[PDB]
Short mmCIF file of C-alpha atoms in Angstrom, two decimals:
data_model
loop_
_atom_site.label_atom_id
_atom_site.label_comp_id
_atom_site.label_asym_id
_atom_site.label_seq_id
_atom_site.Cartn_x
_atom_site.Cartn_y
_atom_site.Cartn_z
CA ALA A 196 51.48 55.11 -30.37
CA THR A 197 51.40 57.08 -27.11
CA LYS A 198 49.86 60.47 -26.34
CA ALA A 199 49.84 62.69 -23.26
CA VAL A 200 47.72 65.79 -22.64
CA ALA A 201 47.75 67.83 -19.43
CA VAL A 202 45.30 70.68 -18.77
CA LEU A 203 44.97 72.72 -15.58
CA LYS A 204 42.84 75.82 -15.03
CA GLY A 205 43.70 76.52 -11.40
CA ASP A 206 45.50 79.26 -9.51
CA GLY A 207 47.42 76.59 -7.58
CA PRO A 208 51.14 76.27 -8.24
CA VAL A 209 52.42 73.27 -10.17
CA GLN A 210 55.12 71.25 -8.39
CA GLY A 211 56.76 68.25 -10.04
CA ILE A 212 57.01 66.81 -13.55
CA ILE A 213 54.32 67.00 -16.23
CA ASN A 214 54.03 64.42 -19.03
CA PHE A 215 57.11 62.54 -17.83
CA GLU A 216 57.68 59.60 -20.18
CA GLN A 217 60.80 57.82 -18.93
CA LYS A 218 61.23 54.70 -21.04
CA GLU A 219 63.73 51.82 -21.26
CA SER A 220 66.09 53.53 -18.83
CA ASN A 221 67.67 52.92 -15.42
CA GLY A 222 67.44 55.74 -12.90
CA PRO A 223 65.86 56.44 -9.51
CA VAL A 224 63.77 59.46 -10.45
CA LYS A 225 62.98 61.49 -7.34
CA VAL A 226 60.52 64.39 -7.12
CA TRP A 227 60.49 66.69 -4.08
CA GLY A 228 57.73 69.25 -3.66
CA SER A 229 57.45 71.68 -0.75
CA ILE A 230 55.25 74.76 -0.32
CA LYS A 231 54.96 76.70 2.95
CA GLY A 232 52.52 79.59 2.56
CA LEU A 233 48.90 80.56 2.02
CA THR A 234 46.75 80.96 -1.09
CA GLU A 235 43.42 82.72 -1.61
CA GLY A 236 40.50 82.54 -4.02
CA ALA B 283 54.81 57.95 -32.48
CA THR B 284 54.65 59.96 -29.25
CA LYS B 285 53.07 63.34 -28.56
CA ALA B 286 52.97 65.60 -25.51
CA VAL B 287 50.81 68.69 -24.97
CA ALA B 288 50.75 70.77 -21.78
CA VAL B 289 48.26 73.59 -21.20
CA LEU B 290 47.85 75.67 -18.04
CA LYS B 291 45.68 78.76 -17.57
CA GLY B 292 46.47 79.51 -13.93
CA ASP B 293 48.21 82.30 -12.05
CA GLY B 294 50.12 79.68 -10.05
CA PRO B 295 53.85 79.39 -10.64
CA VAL B 296 55.20 76.37 -12.51
CA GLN B 297 57.88 74.40 -10.65
CA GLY B 298 59.59 71.40 -12.23
CA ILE B 299 59.91 69.92 -15.72
CA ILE B 300 57.27 70.05 -18.45
CA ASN B 301 57.06 67.43 -21.22
CA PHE B 302 60.13 65.60 -19.94
CA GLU B 303 60.78 62.63 -22.24
CA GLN B 304 63.90 60.91 -20.91
CA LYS B 305 64.40 57.76 -22.97
CA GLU B 306 66.93 54.90 -23.12
CA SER B 307 69.23 56.67 -20.66
CA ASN B 308 70.75 56.12 -17.22
CA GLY B 309 70.45 58.97 -14.74
CA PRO B 310 68.79 59.69 -11.39
CA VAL B 311 66.69 62.68 -12.41
CA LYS B 312 65.82 64.74 -9.33
CA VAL B 313 63.34 67.62 -9.19
CA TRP B 314 63.22 69.96 -6.19
CA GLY B 315 60.43 72.49 -5.85
CA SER B 316 60.07 74.95 -2.98
CA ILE B 317 57.83 78.02 -2.63
CA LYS B 318 57.46 80.00 0.61
CA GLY B 319 55.00 82.86 0.14
CA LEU B 320 51.38 83.78 -0.48
CA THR B 321 49.28 84.12 -3.63
CA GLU B 322 45.94 85.83 -4.23
CA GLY B 323 43.08 85.59 -6.70
CA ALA C 168 58.04 60.77 -34.66
CA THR C 169 57.86 62.79 -31.43
CA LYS C 170 56.26 66.17 -30.76
CA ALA C 171 56.14 68.44 -27.71
CA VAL C 172 53.97 71.52 -27.19
CA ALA C 173 53.89 73.61 -24.01
CA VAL C 174 51.39 76.43 -23.46
CA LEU C 175 50.96 78.52 -20.30
CA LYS C 176 48.77 81.60 -19.85
CA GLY C 177 49.54 82.36 -16.21
CA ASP C 178 51.26 85.16 -14.33
CA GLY C 179 53.18 82.55 -12.32
CA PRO C 180 56.92 82.27 -12.89
CA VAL C 181 58.28 79.26 -14.74
CA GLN C 182 60.96 77.30 -12.86
CA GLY C 183 62.68 74.30 -14.43
CA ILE C 184 63.03 72.81 -17.91
CA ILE C 185 60.40 72.92 -20.66
CA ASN C 186 60.21 70.30 -23.42
CA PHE C 187 63.28 68.48 -22.11
CA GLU C 188 63.95 65.50 -24.41
CA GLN C 189 67.07 63.79 -23.05
CA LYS C 190 67.59 60.64 -25.10
CA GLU C 191 70.12 57.80 -25.23
CA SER C 192 72.41 59.58 -22.77
CA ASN C 193 73.91 59.04 -19.32
CA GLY C 194 73.59 61.90 -16.85
CA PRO C 195 71.92 62.62 -13.51
CA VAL C 196 69.81 65.60 -14.54
CA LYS C 197 68.92 67.67 -11.48
CA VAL C 198 66.43 70.55 -11.36
CA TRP C 199 66.29 72.88 -8.36
CA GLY C 200 63.49 75.41 -8.05
CA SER C 201 63.11 77.88 -5.18
CA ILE C 202 60.86 80.94 -4.85
CA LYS C 203 60.47 82.93 -1.63
CA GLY C 204 58.00 85.78 -2.12
CA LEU C 205 54.38 86.69 -2.75
CA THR C 206 52.29 87.01 -5.91
CA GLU C 207 48.95 88.71 -6.54
CA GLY C 208 46.10 88.45 -9.01
CA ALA D 111 82.91 44.60 8.60
CA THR D 112 82.84 42.52 5.41
CA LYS D 113 85.52 40.29 3.90
CA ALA D 114 85.74 38.31 0.67
CA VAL D 115 88.36 35.72 -0.30
CA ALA D 116 88.36 33.74 -3.55
CA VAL D 117 90.80 30.89 -4.23
CA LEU D 118 90.87 28.62 -7.28
CA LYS D 119 93.52 26.05 -8.19
CA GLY D 120 92.04 24.76 -11.44
CA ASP D 121 93.02 24.85 -15.09
CA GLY D 122 89.46 25.88 -15.97
CA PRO D 123 88.91 29.39 -17.29
CA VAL D 124 87.21 31.95 -15.06
CA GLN D 125 84.13 33.60 -16.58
CA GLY D 126 82.23 36.32 -14.74
CA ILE D 127 82.84 38.59 -11.75
CA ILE D 128 84.87 37.71 -8.66
CA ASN D 129 84.25 39.34 -5.26
CA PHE D 130 81.52 41.59 -6.67
CA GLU D 131 80.21 43.77 -3.83
CA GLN D 132 77.54 46.01 -5.34
CA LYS D 133 75.98 47.97 -2.49
CA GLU D 134 73.29 50.64 -2.11
CA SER D 135 73.03 51.08 -5.87
CA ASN D 136 70.45 50.71 -8.65
CA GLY D 137 71.51 48.76 -11.72
CA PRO D 138 70.57 45.55 -13.54
CA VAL D 139 73.93 43.81 -13.43
CA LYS D 140 74.12 41.20 -16.19
CA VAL D 141 76.84 38.56 -16.60
CA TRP D 142 77.15 36.58 -19.84
CA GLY D 143 79.53 33.64 -20.04
CA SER D 144 80.06 31.50 -23.14
CA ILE D 145 82.78 28.94 -23.92
CA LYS D 146 82.72 26.68 -26.99
CA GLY D 147 85.74 24.38 -27.00
CA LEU D 148 87.45 21.47 -25.27
CA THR D 149 89.79 21.23 -22.29
CA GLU D 150 92.09 18.43 -21.14
CA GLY D 151 93.71 17.27 -17.92
CA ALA E 189 85.81 48.09 6.81
CA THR E 190 85.78 45.96 3.65
CA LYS E 191 88.50 43.73 2.19
CA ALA E 192 88.77 41.71 -1.01
CA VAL E 193 91.42 39.12 -1.91
CA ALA E 194 91.46 37.10 -5.13
CA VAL E 195 93.93 34.26 -5.75
CA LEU E 196 94.05 31.94 -8.77
CA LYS E 197 96.73 29.39 -9.61
CA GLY E 198 95.29 28.04 -12.86
CA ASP E 199 96.31 28.08 -16.51
CA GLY E 200 92.74 29.07 -17.43
CA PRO E 201 92.17 32.56 -18.80
CA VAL E 202 90.43 35.13 -16.63
CA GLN E 203 87.35 36.73 -18.20
CA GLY E 204 85.41 39.46 -16.41
CA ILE E 205 85.97 41.78 -13.45
CA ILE E 206 87.98 40.96 -10.33
CA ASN E 207 87.31 42.64 -6.97
CA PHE E 208 84.58 44.84 -8.43
CA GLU E 209 83.23 47.05 -5.63
CA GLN E 210 80.56 49.25 -7.20
CA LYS E 211 78.95 51.23 -4.40
CA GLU E 212 76.23 53.88 -4.07
CA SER E 213 76.00 54.26 -7.85
CA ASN E 214 73.45 53.84 -10.64
CA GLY E 215 74.55 51.85 -13.67
CA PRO E 216 73.65 48.60 -15.45
CA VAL E 217 77.04 46.89 -15.28
CA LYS E 218 77.27 44.24 -18.00
CA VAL E 219 80.01 41.63 -18.36
CA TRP E 220 80.37 39.60 -21.56
CA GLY E 221 82.78 36.68 -21.70
CA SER E 222 83.36 34.50 -24.76
CA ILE E 223 86.10 31.96 -25.48
CA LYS E 224 86.09 29.65 -28.52
CA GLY E 225 89.14 27.38 -28.47
CA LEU E 226 90.85 24.51 -26.68
CA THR E 227 93.17 24.33 -23.68
CA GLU E 228 95.48 21.57 -22.47
CA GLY E 229 97.08 20.48 -19.22
CA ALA F 103 88.83 51.38 5.06
CA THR F 104 88.83 49.23 1.91
CA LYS F 105 91.56 47.00 0.48
CA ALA F 106 91.85 44.96 -2.70
CA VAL F 107 94.51 42.38 -3.58
CA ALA F 108 94.57 40.33 -6.79
CA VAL F 109 97.05 37.50 -7.37
CA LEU F 110 97.19 35.16 -10.37
CA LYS F 111 99.88 32.61 -11.19
CA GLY F 112 98.46 31.24 -14.44
CA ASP F 113 99.50 31.26 -18.08
CA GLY F 114 95.94 32.23 -19.03
CA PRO F 115 95.37 35.71 -20.43
CA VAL F 116 93.61 38.30 -18.28
CA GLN F 117 90.53 39.88 -19.87
CA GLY F 118 88.58 42.62 -18.11
CA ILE F 119 89.12 44.95 -15.16
CA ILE F 120 91.11 44.16 -12.02
CA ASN F 121 90.42 45.85 -8.68
CA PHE F 122 87.70 48.04 -10.17
CA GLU F 123 86.32 50.26 -7.39
CA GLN F 124 83.65 52.45 -8.99
CA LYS F 125 82.03 54.45 -6.20
CA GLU F 126 79.30 57.09 -5.91
CA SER F 127 79.09 57.45 -9.69
CA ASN F 128 76.56 57.00 -12.50
CA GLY F 129 77.68 55.00 -15.51
CA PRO F 130 76.80 51.74 -17.27
CA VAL F 131 80.19 50.04 -17.08
CA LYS F 132 80.44 47.37 -19.78
CA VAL F 133 83.19 44.76 -20.10
CA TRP F 134 83.57 42.72 -23.29
CA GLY F 135 85.98 39.80 -23.40
CA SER F 136 86.59 37.60 -26.44
CA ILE F 137 89.34 35.06 -27.14
CA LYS F 138 89.35 32.74 -30.16
CA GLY F 139 92.40 30.47 -30.08
CA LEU F 140 94.11 27.62 -28.26
CA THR F 141 96.41 27.46 -25.25
CA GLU F 142 98.72 24.71 -24.01
CA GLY F 143 100.30 23.64 -20.74
#
């Protein structure tokens, strides 16, 4: 019925939820993402 | 009925939940992600 | 009925839950992820 | 700051909530009231 | 800060919650009240 | 800070919660009240 595919090919960090499928519920989902630094290529 | 696939090919750290499938529940899910540093390629 | 596949090919650390399938429950799931350092490639 | 007074002087049945003071929450409050019969004075 | 007073002087049955003060929570409160009969005065 | 007073002077049965003060919680409180009979005065 439902499908979810996530693909990432990057050096960047992942912050948060992936393929979140909250359904028929009751809740204030909160996602907090902080990153304080430097990245290079 | 439902499927979930997650693929990542990156040096970056993973922060959070992957393939979270909360269903028919009651809860304030909270995700906190912090990273203070530097990455290279 | 439901499937969940998670694949990662990265040097980055994993922080959090993987393939979390909370269902028909009642609970404020909380995920805290902190990392203070540097990574290289 | 806030006050609530409820007074009833009737033979009729009470069905539901009295002085409900839900505050700063998150929930679909549902009240169902059914009565199938006869009353007299 | 907050007060709640409930007074009833009736032969009728009480069905439900009285002085319910849910606060800063997360929950689908449900009240079901059924009465199938006859009352007299 | 908060007060709750409940007074009833009726022959009717009490069905449910009285002076319920759920606070800073997470739960789907459910109240079910059924009465199938007859009362007199």
